[PDB]
UniProtKB/Swiss-Prot annotation, chain A:
Domain of life: Eukaryota
Family of the protein in this entry: Belongs to the nucleoporin Nup85 family.
Organism: Xenopus laevis (African clawed frog)
Transmembrane segments: none
Oligomeric form and interacting partners: Component of the nuclear pore complex (NPC).
Name of the molecule in the record: Nuclear pore complex protein Nup85
Amino acid sequence: TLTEFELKWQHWREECERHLQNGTVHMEAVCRVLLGDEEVLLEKRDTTWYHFLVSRLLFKHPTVKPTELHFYAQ
Amino acid sequence: QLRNLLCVLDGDLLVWDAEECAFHTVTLRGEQKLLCTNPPLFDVNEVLLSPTQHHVALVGSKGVMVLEIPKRWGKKSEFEGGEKTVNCRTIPIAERIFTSSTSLLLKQAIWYPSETQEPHLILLTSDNILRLYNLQDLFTPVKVISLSSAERSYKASLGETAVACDFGPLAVLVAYPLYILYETGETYLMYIDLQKSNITVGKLLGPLPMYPAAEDNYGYDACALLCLPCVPNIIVIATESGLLYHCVVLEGLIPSLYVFECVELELACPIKLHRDPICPSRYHCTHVAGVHSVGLTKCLVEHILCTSPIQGFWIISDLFLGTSMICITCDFECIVRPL
């Protein structure tokens, strides 16, 4: 149930990346996000520090480890 | 991902089709479709033919199902007398455990090596529990063995998971030695005897003394174990990095593992190990990048196939067909090579 989700997620991210490559500003940025791109997640950090954290995790690290959450938050 | 979705039965190639939930059969010496009456609710990663050749286990990370192989009859010895589509009885194993526990993964399934007994199936799960099932009672395991030190498993809670297990030849304590590999490279031994109705399982005893002691713990990357059927027992431990440790099992009394050789596969990656039924000094390694053949003479490593992950691998040893390896890639390219 977990590994299966992971592989589907990987496939979707591959598809999004391919679409981005083919296209190469707003949907550009949105699919920048759907992959978890650190810059575009930074340039519109305008809500809070924890909001930033949550967005970052959701996109960059869909699987979250409770033990390393402290480092991520710092 | 690397998978093993094919097997060979009596000179028929069976190829699992996940979309149709069926085996396609080809008589190598004639196309039939063996349809599952109850389709698997999980992605099949491996197909295991029973020692009795009457059952096929469909194995996935979230479940196991056994298909009952239909009877052969008629002039050509075809399934159900040569019907194009044969409805096969399928029986889910341990379904309640995988449905109740969203985090529980099957690490490996293996058949108990006895041909004369009812085929017993052993399930290794990510909680460090070995569960032994009989095909008569598939809801309740006949035996449950926790792989914690006898002083979730405490070890599984520490992150030490058992990854692979394999049977050695019948040994006088007569029982089958089961070797069990942890992700840490730690190997344990247990004796299993199945006498008709009573399952005698020995204590877990895995204090194998590495010869030579590891300077840095055999990486947290140990992925497969293979026992070669020889005396003394030779254990092959494979890592995700491509290192293969050839360990000779000697008496110490807990037995010790003497590393005779360490062999790196030039892979440029989880490895599956396959015994050669004809050459006991040879085995095959299937991985995402190809097939290696390893011959114990340094060991002779041949990169047979450089890929497109392997979706199925088997060694045919038939009088009429000869000895040949069959490889199927993820793109369904069928590569046959004489061995």
